[PDB]
Amino acid sequence: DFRVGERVWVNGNKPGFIQFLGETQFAPGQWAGIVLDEPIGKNDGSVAGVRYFQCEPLKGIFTRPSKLTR
């Protein structure tokens, strides 16, 4: 369904873009790495030193795809 580059909302009210979609090193299953319009996230695209995508500090967040709306 979802694709890298897509405009999305996290929990229906945090706008951003998908920058990563896949499995990761930090937790099982599928993850979407999002760059958020506002710096209200958790990371810069990296988690525990592992780089999944690149953005400015706190503009990145990883969430389950089921939490996204296109």
Partner: peptide, 8 residues
């Protein structure tokens, strides 16, 4: 905030 629970 809470919305980020279960996120990384």
């Amino acid at each position: 905030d809470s919305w980020k629970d279960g996120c990384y």
